[PDB]
Design a protein around this ligand. Sequence first.
Ligand SMILES: *[C@@H]1O[C@H](CO)[C@@H](O[C@@H]2O[C@H](CO)[C@@H](O)[C@H](O)[C@H]2NC(C)=O)[C@H](O)[C@H]1NC(C)=O
Ligand SMILES: *[C@@H]1O[C@H](CO)[C@@H](O[C@@H]2O[C@H](CO)[C@@H](O)[C@H](O)[C@H]2NC(C)=O)[C@H](O)[C@H]1NC(C)=O
Ligand SMILES: *[C@@H]1O[C@H](CO)[C@@H](O[C@@H]2O[C@H](CO)[C@@H](O)[C@H](O)[C@H]2NC(C)=O)[C@H](O)[C@H]1NC(C)=O
Ligand SMILES: *[C@@H]1O[C@H](CO)[C@@H](O[C@@H]2O[C@H](CO)[C@@H](O)[C@H](O)[C@H]2NC(C)=O)[C@H](O)[C@H]1NC(C)=O
Ligand SMILES: CC(C)CCC[C@@H](C)[C@H]1CC[C@H]2[C@@H]3CC=C4C[C@@H](O)CC[C@]4(C)[C@H]3CC[C@]12C
Ligand SMILES: CC(C)CCC[C@@H](C)[C@H]1CC[C@H]2[C@@H]3CC=C4C[C@@H](O)CC[C@]4(C)[C@H]3CC[C@]12C
Ligand SMILES: CC(C)CCC[C@@H](C)[C@H]1CC[C@H]2[C@@H]3CC=C4C[C@@H](O)CC[C@]4(C)[C@H]3CC[C@]12C
Ligand SMILES: CC(C)CCC[C@@H](C)[C@H]1CC[C@H]2[C@@H]3CC=C4C[C@@H](O)CC[C@]4(C)[C@H]3CC[C@]12C
Ligand SMILES: CC(C)CCC[C@@H](C)[C@H]1CC[C@H]2[C@@H]3CC=C4C[C@@H](O)CC[C@]4(C)[C@H]3CC[C@]12C
Ligand SMILES: CC(C)CCC[C@@H](C)[C@H]1CC[C@H]2[C@@H]3CC=C4C[C@@H](O)CC[C@]4(C)[C@H]3CC[C@]12C
Ligand SMILES: CC(C)CCC[C@@H](C)[C@H]1CC[C@H]2[C@@H]3CC=C4C[C@@H](O)CC[C@]4(C)[C@H]3CC[C@]12C
Ligand SMILES: COc1cccc([C@@H](C)NCCCc2ccccc2Cl)c1
Ligand SMILES: COc1cccc([C@@H](C)NCCCc2ccccc2Cl)c1
Ligand SMILES: O=C(O)[C@@H]1Cc2c([nH]c3ccccc23)CN1
Ligand SMILES: O=C(O)[C@@H]1Cc2c([nH]c3ccccc23)CN1
Ligand SMILES: *[C@@H]1O[C@H](CO)[C@@H](O)[C@H](O)[C@H]1NC(C)=O
Ligand SMILES: *[C@@H]1O[C@H](CO)[C@@H](O)[C@H](O)[C@H]1NC(C)=O
Ligand SMILES: *[C@@H]1O[C@H](CO)[C@@H](O)[C@H](O)[C@H]1NC(C)=O
Ligand SMILES: *[C@@H]1O[C@H](CO)[C@@H](O)[C@H](O)[C@H]1NC(C)=O
Ligand SMILES: *[C@@H]1O[C@H](CO)[C@@H](O)[C@H](O)[C@H]1NC(C)=O
Ligand SMILES: *[C@@H]1O[C@H](CO)[C@@H](O)[C@H](O)[C@H]1NC(C)=O
Ligand SMILES: [Ca+2]
Ligand SMILES: [Ca+2]
Ligand SMILES: [Ca+2]
Ligand SMILES: [Ca+2]
Ligand SMILES: [Ca+2]
Ligand SMILES: [Ca+2]
Ligand SMILES: [Ca+2]
Ligand SMILES: [Ca+2]
Lengths: 781, 781
Amino acid sequence: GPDQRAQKKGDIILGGLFPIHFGVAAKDQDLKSRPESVECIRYNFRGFRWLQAMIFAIEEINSSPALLPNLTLGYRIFDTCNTVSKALEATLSFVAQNKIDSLIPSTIAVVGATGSGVSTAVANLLGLFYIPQVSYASSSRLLSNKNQFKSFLRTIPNDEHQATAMADIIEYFRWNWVGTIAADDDYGRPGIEKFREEAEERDICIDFSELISQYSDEEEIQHVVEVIQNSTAKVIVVFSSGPDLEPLIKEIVRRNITGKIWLASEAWASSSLIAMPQYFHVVGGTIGFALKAGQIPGFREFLKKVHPRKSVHNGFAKEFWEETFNCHLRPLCTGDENISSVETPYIDYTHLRISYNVYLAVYSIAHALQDIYTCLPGRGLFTNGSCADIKKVEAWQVLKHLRHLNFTNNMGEQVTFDECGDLVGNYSIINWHLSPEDGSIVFKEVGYYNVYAKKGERLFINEEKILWSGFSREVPFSNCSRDCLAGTRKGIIEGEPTCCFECVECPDGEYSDETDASACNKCPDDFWSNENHTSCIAKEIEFLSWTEPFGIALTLFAVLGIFLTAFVLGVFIKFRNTPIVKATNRELSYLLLFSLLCCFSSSLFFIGEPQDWTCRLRQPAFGISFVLCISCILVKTNRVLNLQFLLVFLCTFMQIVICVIWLYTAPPSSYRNQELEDEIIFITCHEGSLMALGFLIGYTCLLAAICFFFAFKSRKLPENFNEAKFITFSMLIFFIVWISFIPAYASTYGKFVSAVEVIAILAASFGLLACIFFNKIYIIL
Amino acid sequence: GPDQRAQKKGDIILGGLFPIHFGVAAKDQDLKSRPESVECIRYNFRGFRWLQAMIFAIEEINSSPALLPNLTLGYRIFDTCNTVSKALEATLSFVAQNKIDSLIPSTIAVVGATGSGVSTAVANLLGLFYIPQVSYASSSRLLSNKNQFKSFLRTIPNDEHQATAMADIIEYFRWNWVGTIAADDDYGRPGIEKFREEAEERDICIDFSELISQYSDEEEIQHVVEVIQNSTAKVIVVFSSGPDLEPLIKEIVRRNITGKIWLASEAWASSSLIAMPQYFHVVGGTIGFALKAGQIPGFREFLKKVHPRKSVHNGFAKEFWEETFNCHLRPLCTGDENISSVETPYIDYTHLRISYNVYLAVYSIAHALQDIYTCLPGRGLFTNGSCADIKKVEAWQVLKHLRHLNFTNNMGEQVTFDECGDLVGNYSIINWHLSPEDGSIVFKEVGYYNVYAKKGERLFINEEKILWSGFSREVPFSNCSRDCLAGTRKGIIEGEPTCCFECVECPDGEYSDETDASACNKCPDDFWSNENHTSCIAKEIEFLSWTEPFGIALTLFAVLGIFLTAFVLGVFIKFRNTPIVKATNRELSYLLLFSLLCCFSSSLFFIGEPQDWTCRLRQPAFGISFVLCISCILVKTNRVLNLQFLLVFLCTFMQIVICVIWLYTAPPSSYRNQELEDEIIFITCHEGSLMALGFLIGYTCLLAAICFFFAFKSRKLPENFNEAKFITFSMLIFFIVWISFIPAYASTYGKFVSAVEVIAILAASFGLLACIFFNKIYIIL
Ligand SMILES: *[C@@H]1O[C@H](CO)[C@@H](O[C@@H]2O[C@H](CO)[C@@H](O)[C@H](O)[C@H]2NC(C)=O)[C@H](O)[C@H]1NC(C)=O
Ligand SMILES: *[C@@H]1O[C@H](CO)[C@@H](O[C@@H]2O[C@H](CO)[C@@H](O)[C@H](O)[C@H]2NC(C)=O)[C@H](O)[C@H]1NC(C)=O
Ligand SMILES: *[C@@H]1O[C@H](CO)[C@@H](O[C@@H]2O[C@H](CO)[C@@H](O)[C@H](O)[C@H]2NC(C)=O)[C@H](O)[C@H]1NC(C)=O
Ligand SMILES: *[C@@H]1O[C@H](CO)[C@@H](O[C@@H]2O[C@H](CO)[C@@H](O)[C@H](O)[C@H]2NC(C)=O)[C@H](O)[C@H]1NC(C)=O
Ligand SMILES: CC(C)CCC[C@@H](C)[C@H]1CC[C@H]2[C@@H]3CC=C4C[C@@H](O)CC[C@]4(C)[C@H]3CC[C@]12C
Ligand SMILES: CC(C)CCC[C@@H](C)[C@H]1CC[C@H]2[C@@H]3CC=C4C[C@@H](O)CC[C@]4(C)[C@H]3CC[C@]12C
Ligand SMILES: CC(C)CCC[C@@H](C)[C@H]1CC[C@H]2[C@@H]3CC=C4C[C@@H](O)CC[C@]4(C)[C@H]3CC[C@]12C
Ligand SMILES: CC(C)CCC[C@@H](C)[C@H]1CC[C@H]2[C@@H]3CC=C4C[C@@H](O)CC[C@]4(C)[C@H]3CC[C@]12C
Ligand SMILES: CC(C)CCC[C@@H](C)[C@H]1CC[C@H]2[C@@H]3CC=C4C[C@@H](O)CC[C@]4(C)[C@H]3CC[C@]12C
Ligand SMILES: CC(C)CCC[C@@H](C)[C@H]1CC[C@H]2[C@@H]3CC=C4C[C@@H](O)CC[C@]4(C)[C@H]3CC[C@]12C
Ligand SMILES: CC(C)CCC[C@@H](C)[C@H]1CC[C@H]2[C@@H]3CC=C4C[C@@H](O)CC[C@]4(C)[C@H]3CC[C@]12C
Ligand SMILES: COc1cccc([C@@H](C)NCCCc2ccccc2Cl)c1
Ligand SMILES: COc1cccc([C@@H](C)NCCCc2ccccc2Cl)c1
Ligand SMILES: O=C(O)[C@@H]1Cc2c([nH]c3ccccc23)CN1
Ligand SMILES: O=C(O)[C@@H]1Cc2c([nH]c3ccccc23)CN1
Ligand SMILES: *[C@@H]1O[C@H](CO)[C@@H](O)[C@H](O)[C@H]1NC(C)=O
Ligand SMILES: *[C@@H]1O[C@H](CO)[C@@H](O)[C@H](O)[C@H]1NC(C)=O
Ligand SMILES: *[C@@H]1O[C@H](CO)[C@@H](O)[C@H](O)[C@H]1NC(C)=O
Ligand SMILES: *[C@@H]1O[C@H](CO)[C@@H](O)[C@H](O)[C@H]1NC(C)=O
Ligand SMILES: *[C@@H]1O[C@H](CO)[C@@H](O)[C@H](O)[C@H]1NC(C)=O
Ligand SMILES: *[C@@H]1O[C@H](CO)[C@@H](O)[C@H](O)[C@H]1NC(C)=O
Ligand SMILES: [Ca+2]
Ligand SMILES: [Ca+2]
Ligand SMILES: [Ca+2]
Ligand SMILES: [Ca+2]
Ligand SMILES: [Ca+2]
Ligand SMILES: [Ca+2]
Ligand SMILES: [Ca+2]
Ligand SMILES: [Ca+2]
C-alpha cells in the first residue's frame, strides 16, 4: 500500500484508517500523461491524535497481562486524507491474502474510517471478505443496513437521534421557519432527510434546502449564499463536516452575513476548520452537538512522548513534527523541540470524544479476541458449540464474537453492539462562545440530549448559559409571520407554506380570543362581538322600562290621570244632591269615570317589560274601557237628543266578543326581535291576528263616528249646561290624537312604540275627561 | 473470479457486468461456520439479453473491417445478481494486474453495471485505477460527480430530467395531493429528493414519503401499506426498480388496494416483476417512463442462435437453457428445443432500450479505441500532441479518448459524453393497459418528454389514449380539498399543508368571484355584496322621487293647493268691488294668497332628489312664506282689535335676516348617509346649524303664539263676518299639525322625513287658506 504508514508486527494485525490529512490536492487530472498518486495537503492534527489513540490502546492491551495473554497485537494504519481512493488502496492492502484466495500480514479487523462515504466504500470491500470493521466516527444510518454491510460496527451513535434532537431544539425555542444545509455525501443527505421528516411532523417549515461540498464551484457557493441571504429565516440546520462546510463559511464571511443562528451537527460542531476567531461574527453563538467525553488515563503523556526518531513504528510522526514546528528533518530542526511550546489540536484539547471512540473500538476488537481466547470447549458460538482457535483465528470468527460483545469500560459502562452494530450514546449540547483572555472560540456546554429518556423528555437546555450570535441574551425570532393578537384570524398566502400567513381582523359579530386563531369563532345567538373582536359581549335588551326616566314620566302622567278621575268621582259622590250632577245621568257618570280609570290602567300596561299576558291584555283593556266610555257618552247624547245600560252593555259586549274571539284564536305573544339591530334585542309583541286589530279599532272608531255624528246633529242645543258641544270636542280630540299618531306608529319599531301608545291613550282619556267633567267642575268650582 | 462467466480472448479485453439473476438467496448467515459464496436464485432473462447485446456488439465490431482493423476485441463478463458483493468480486477480477502494480488479462474498459449502488461501488474501485466504466442502466445523479467517480460514463440519461418530468405530469393533470415511494438506495433517494424539490416549486403537496427495499421486513411493508391506505392522495410517485418494489406490490395485491394512480420511474415502468396480469387490479393504468427505443439489425437472429453447446464462450447459456425449458443438461433435455416455443422476456420484447444502451456503450469504447488507432502523430490528446500506441494501449488513455468522444450511430445520431459523462436522451411516456386477446399487460405509448425542449414545453401527453386504473377514461381526483365555488374563501387547517383548506363563505359586504379565492375582496363604498357573494351589486339609492307614486300624490296635492289659491285669488280680483272683500284688507288678502302660493312652492321643494341648493332653499322658503302669511293675519287681527305693510315687512325682514345669517355661516348640504342601512344609501340633507333651525321654528311659532293670543282676545267679536274665530281656528290647526308630527320627525330618518314635512306644510297651508277664505267663498258662493 502507501509508503507513509504506521506498521507494527504481531500475532494479530489490526487495520487502521485515519484522516491524517484533511483532503487531497484539488485539481482536474488532464489525462494527457499517466496519472500519479494524488497528494493530500492540509495536515489534520486531530486525526493524528486519533491514530495515536489507536496505537496507545494497542500498546496498553499488549502491556496488560489480563487481556490477551501471550498474544501480541500489531497494526497497519494508513492515511485516508478523507478520500475514498486512498482508503480503498489501504483496504486493498488489507485484503491481499483474501484477494489471493478469492481471485503481507493478514488483517483481522479494521478501525475506521471517519467519513461515512469513505466508510461505506471501505465496508463494501471488507464485508466482501467478512473482515470486521469498527468505525469511530462514521454515523450515517445507511451503514446500519446489514444486508449491504455485513461486517460493519460502530462505536459512535447513529445519526437519527441527532436529527431528532435538532427538531426538538427547534421546537424548544419556538421556531417554525428554518433553513437547511447538508453536505452532499452519505453523512449530510440521510441526516437532513431525517431532520426534514422530524421537522414536518413537528409543524416546522423549512424555507430552503441546499447541498454543499468541499469541491463545490464558485457558482454553487454563490447560489447557496444568495439563497441564505434571500430568506427571512435566521436558524440554519447544517449537517456537514468541517472540510465540506469550509468554502460556504468562507464566502459568508467575505460577504459578512451576520444574524444567522447555526445549528451544528456533531461533525462540525467542534471543528477547528470552522471555529476560528476571524469567523466569529458569522459563526459565533453556534449551537451544536458533541459526543459523550471519555477518559483515557495516560494518553496525554503518550501523546507528549511523540518523536520522529523514537517513533520508529509510526511513520506519520515525521510530518507531524515538520508541521508542528514548521521545520524540516524551511529551517532545519534538531528534533529537541517541545510539543507543549506549540498550540495545535494535538494537545490543545479538553475532551476526548472521537479519540475515546477509537480507544473503544480497539478495546472492543481486543475483547472479542479475548472471548475467543477464553472460550470453553463446549460453549462456543460456532457450529456444535465449538470454539475458534486463537492461534489460527479468522476474521469472520472475530466478527461473530463482536456481534455478541458485552464488556465493561475503564469508565465502568457496558459496551454492546445491536443487530445493526450501533452503539447508542448520549449527546451534549454546546454553544460557541468567545474567550475574553485569548480570543479563541470556546465550546460551552449548555445542555444535553438523553437518548435513553422517553420522547419529549430527552432534551435539556440551560438557556441562561446561551449567548445568541455570541453576545446576545435574547432568543432570536425565526418565525415566518408574526403571531398577531386576538381579534384577528390567520389566512392563507398563495404559493407559501402554512407557517407564513396573513391575519385579517374578525368580521362583525365574530370573536377571536386566541393568538394564532385559524378561524373567527361566532358569538352565540344572544351575544355580539366586542369592539376589537377580542371577546364577546351580551346583546343589550331594550324595551320601555319602569325605572328609565321616560317610563317614569309616563307612569306619573298615568297616576295623575287616575288621581284626577278619582277627584272628579269623589266630587260627584259627595255632592250628588246638587242640581248640576242630577241633570246628567249620575249612574252613567260613575260608569264613565270607572271606564276612564280602566283606560288609565290599560295605559299602565304598555309600560314595562313585555310578557305573554301583558301583550295579551294591552289592546283589549283599552278597547273595552274606551268602548264603554264612548257608549256612556252615546246614551247621554241620546237622552240629550235602564235602556241606557242596555245600550252600553250591547256595545261593550260586541267589542268584548271580538276580543274573546281573537284571544281564543291567536293570542298576542312577546318576541325578541333581533334583525332590526344587530347589537340590540328589541323585546316587543306580535299581535297575532292583524285583521283582529283592524276589527277592534274599526269598532271603536265606528262607535266613535256614530257618537260624533249624533253629537254634531245636536251641537247647538243647550242642555245639561250644553254638554253636547263638549262631547263633540272630546270626540274630535280623540280623532285628532289617534289620526295624528299614525306617522308615529308607522315604521317606528323600537322601545318608542309603547311610548307612543301610552301617550295616545293618555291624551285621548284626558281630553274626554276634561271635556265631559271639567265644565261641571267649573260650575261647582 | 466467479466460475460462471462469459469469456473470450482478444487483444483488448472489455469487462462486463450484467444482472443474469434478479438477486441472491435469503441466507443471512449466523456465522456458525465459514461463510460460503452466496447463490443467486431468480433468473433474469432480460439481463441475459443485455449480456447477449454486449457479446453481439463485440462480435459485430470484430467482423467489421472498418472499425478496429487487425485488432480483436475480447470480453470477460460476470453476473452481478444486482448485488454489490458479487459485482465487487468481478471488479477485483478485472483489476488484478492493477492491484499487482499497486500493492489474468488486462481490462481496458468495463460495461455496467445496472444498479446505481452497484455501479457506485464498482466505480470506486475502477476509478481508483482510472479504468473507464460505461454504464448502460445506472442513472443516479450521484454518479455525475467526477470528483468521486473519475472514470464513469453513461449511455443512459441522468435521473434529474425524469423527476422533473414527473412533476410536470402531476402539474398537467392538475394534482396537488400525491404520495411518494422510493427505493432505499442510490437510485430511489436522489430521484425522490429531486422530485420533492420540483414538486415544492410547483405548489404540489406530498402527503407521505416512504422507503422500501427487497429486504424490507414484514413490519416495514405493513407500515408502508397502512400509510398508503391512511392517505387520501390517489397519485403515488414511485422511484424504484422491480425487485425493490415487488414485496410492496405483493402486499398491496394481498390486501387488494385499488384506485391508486401509480407514476412509474423508468426502472420499473417496464418491469416484468411488477407488470403481471394478476396484479393488474392494483397496478393497472400505471403511467411510466421508458427510454428511446433503438434498432440493432441482426440482434434477434443472434438471440435465436443461442445454444448450450454451440455457445462455448458464453457460460451463462447453460442456465438460460435450463430455465427456459425447465430441463437439465427435472426432465433431461436433448438440446433440440426451440426458443420461439417458449415465451420469456428474452425474445418477447417490442423495443430495445437498455439493450441499445449496452450496444452503444460497446461501440463507444470501440470508437474510443478507433480514435486511438487513427491518431495522427502530431494531433494527439496527450502531452505534446502525442498519440497512444494502440498495440500497448492503457485504460486511462481510453478514458481520455472517451471524454472526447463524437461518433455517429447506426441510427444516424451523434453520441457524445459531457463533462459528467452523461448522455442526454428523450423519454417516452407509456400507460399500462390490459391485452384483450392474451390478458397480459401492454405498455401503450401515450406521450413523450422532450429534454431538448425548453422548460414548460417538454411534456406532451395524449390523454385520450390513457386508461386510468386500466379501464377508466375520466382523469381521477387527487386533490386534498375540493376547489369550492365562488362566494367562498379558503382558510387554514392547523397542522396541515396549504393544499388542504376549509373554505368559509364570504362575510356580508364582501365578495369572491373566483374559485380558490385566498381572501374575500371588499368592493367599493357604493357597492354591496351579492346574496351568493359571487359578486357585488350597486347600493340602492333612496330618497323621495318624483316618479314614485307617493311623490306623485304629494305633487298632486301641492298642485291642487296652488290651484285652489289661484281660484280664490281670481275670485277676489274679478269681484273686488263686492262689500265683503272691501271689508277685509284686499291688498293684504292678495299678499296672503301670494304667500300661500310661496308656501306650496316651498312644499314642492322637499319632493325630489336632494341637492345643495335644494337643501338650502327648503326650510327658508316655507319659513318666510308662512311668516308672511301669519304677519298678514296679524295685521288683519290688529285692524279687527301703510302701517300693516310696515309690520309684515318687519316680521319677514327679521326672519330673512335669520335666514341670511345661517346660510352665510353654515349652509345646509346634501349628504349620502351609508350608516343607517348597509345595503341602501339614503340621500338626505344636513341643516348645518341646528341652533339656527331652532331660531327659525322659534320665530315662526312665536309670531304664531302672538297671533293666537291676540285672536283669542277678540274671538267673540263679530267683524268682517267674524273672521277672528276663523283666524283662531287656522292657527290652532297650524299648532295641531306641527305638534302632531313631532313623533314623525323623531328618529324617522329615511325617504319619509321629506314626505312628513311635505304633508305638514300642505296641512298647515290648507288649514290657513280654508279658514281665512272659504267662509268668504261661501258667502259669495
Ligand atoms: C412561532 O410559531 C410557533 C408555531 O406557531 C409558535 O409556537 C406555538 O406557541 C404556542 C404558545 O407557546 C403554543 O400553544 C403552540 O402549540 C406552539 N405551536 C407549535 C409548537 O407548533 C411560537 O410561539 C412562535 N414564536 C413567536 C411568534 O415568536
Ligand atoms: C445520559 O444522560 C442522562 C441525563 O443526563 C443520564 O441520567 C442521569 O444520570 C445521573 C447519574 O449518572 C443522575 O444523577 C441523573 O439524575 C440522571 N438524569 C436523568 C435520569 O434524567 C444518563 O446516565 C446518561 N447516560 C449515559 C450512558 O451516560
Ligand atoms: C387541484 O388543485 C390545483 C391547485 O394547484 C388546481 O390547479 C389550478 O387550477 C387553476 C384553474 O383556474 C389554475 O389557475 C392554477 O394554475 C392551477 N394550479 C396549478 C396547475 O398548480 C386544480 O384545478 C385542482 N383540481 C381539482 C380541484 O380537481
Ligand atoms: C426528442 O423528441 C422531440 C419531439 O418528439 C423530437 O423533435 C421532433 O423531431 C422530429 C424529426 O425527428 C420532427 O418531425 C418533430 O416535429 C420534432 N418535434 C418537436 C421539435 O417538437 C426530437 O428530435 C427528439 N430528440 C431525439 C430523438 O434525440
Ligand atoms: C280613525 C281614522 C283611521 C279614520 C278617520 C275617520 C274620519 C275621517 C271620519 C269618521 C267619522 C267622520 C265624521 C262623522 C260625523 C260627521 C258629522 C257630519 O255632520 C259631517 C261629517 C263628519 C264630520 C264626519 C267627517 C269624517 C269622519 C271624522
Ligand atoms: C296631537 C294631540 C295629542 C294634541 C292636539 C291637541 C288638540 C287635540 C286639542 C288641544 C287644544 C284643543 C282646542 C282648545 C280650544 C278650542 C277652541 C274651541 O272653540 C273649540 C275646541 C278647540 C279647537 C280645542 C280642539 C282640540 C284641541 C286643539
Ligand atoms: C293633510 C291631509 C293629508 C290629512 C292628514 C292625514 C295625515 C295625518 C296622515 C294620513 C296618512 C299618513 C301618512 C301615511 C304614510 C306615511 C308613511 C310613513 O312611513 C311615515 C308617515 C306617513 C308619511 C304618514 C304621514 C301622515 C299621514 C299623511
Ligand atoms: C290633547 C292633549 C294633548 C291635551 C288635552 C288637554 C285639552 C284637550 C283639554 C284639557 C282642559 C280642557 C278645557 C277645559 C276648559 C275649557 C273651557 C270651556 O269653556 C271650553 C272648553 C275648554 C277650553 C276645555 C277644552 C279641552 C281642554 C283644553
Ligand atoms: C310647537 C312648539 C312651539 C310647542 C307649542 C307651544 C304651545 C304649547 C304654546 C305656544 C303658544 C301657546 C298659546 C298662546 C296663546 C294662548 C291664548 C291664551 O289666551 C291662553 C294660552 C294659549 C292658548 C297658549 C297655550 C299654549 C301654546 C299653544
Ligand atoms: C299626552 C299629552 C298630555 C301631551 C301630548 C304631546 C304629544 C303630542 C307629543 C309631545 C312630545 C312628543 C314625544 C316627544 C318624544 C318622543 C320620542 C320619540 O322617539 C317618539 C315620539 C315621542 C314619544 C313623542 C310622542 C308625542 C309627544 C308626547
Ligand atoms: C288640512 C287638513 C288638516 C284637513 C283639515 C281641513 C280643515 C283644515 C278645513 C277644511 C274645510 C274647513 C271648514 C270649511 C267650512 C267651515 C264652516 C264654518 O262655519 C266653520 C269652519 C269650517 C268648519 C272650516 C273649518 C276648517 C276646515 C274643516
Ligand atoms: C283607536 O282606538 C283603539 C282601540 C283599540 C286599541 C287601540 C290601541 C291601544 N292600539 C293601537 C294599535 C297600533 C296600530 C295602529 C295602526 C296600524 C297598526 C297598528 Cl299595530 C286603539
Ligand atoms: C314650524 O314652522 C316652521 C318654520 C320653518 C320651517 C319649518 C319646517 C319646514 N322645518 C321642519 C324641521 C324638522 C325638525 C323638527 C324638530 C326637530 C328636528 C327637525 Cl329636523 C317649520
Ligand atoms: O459520518 C460522518 O461523516 C461524520 C464524520 C465526523 C463526525 N464527527 C466528527 C468529528 C471530527 C471529524 C469528523 C467527524 C460524525 N460523523
Ligand atoms: O440506476 C438504477 O438503479 C436504475 C436501474 C434500472 C433503470 N432502468 C431499468 C430497467 C430494467 C432494470 C433495471 C433498470 C434506470 N436506472
Ligand atoms: C436572491 O435575490 C437576489 C436579488 O434580486 C437575486 O439576484 C438572486 O438571483 C436571488 N436568488 C434566488 C435563489 O432567488
Ligand atoms: C462585518 O459586519 C459587522 C456587523 O455585524 C461589522 O461590525 C464589521 O465591521 C464587518 N466587517 C467587515 C470587515 O466589514
Ligand atoms: C452485560 O453484562 C452485564 C452484567 O455485567 C449485564 O447487566 C448486561 O445486561 C449484559 N449485556 C447484555 C446486552 O446482555
Ligand atoms: C392509520 O390510521 C389508524 C386510525 O387512526 C391508526 O390506528 C393507524 O396507526 C394509522 N396507520 C399509520 C401507518 O399511520
Ligand atoms: C379485488 O379488487 C377488485 C377491484 O376492486 C375486485 O374486482 C376483486 O373482486 C377483488 N378481489 C378480492 C379477492 O377481493
Ligand atoms: C460531432 O460531429 C458532427 C459532424 O459529424 C458535428 O456536427 C458535431 O457538432 C460534433 N459534436 C461535437 C460534440 O463536437
Ligand atoms: Ca478516515
Ligand atoms: Ca497482553
Ligand atoms: Ca473538522
Ligand atoms: Ca412555496
Ligand atoms: Ca448489473
Ligand atoms: Ca474489426
Ligand atoms: Ca425489473
Ligand atoms: Ca402536518
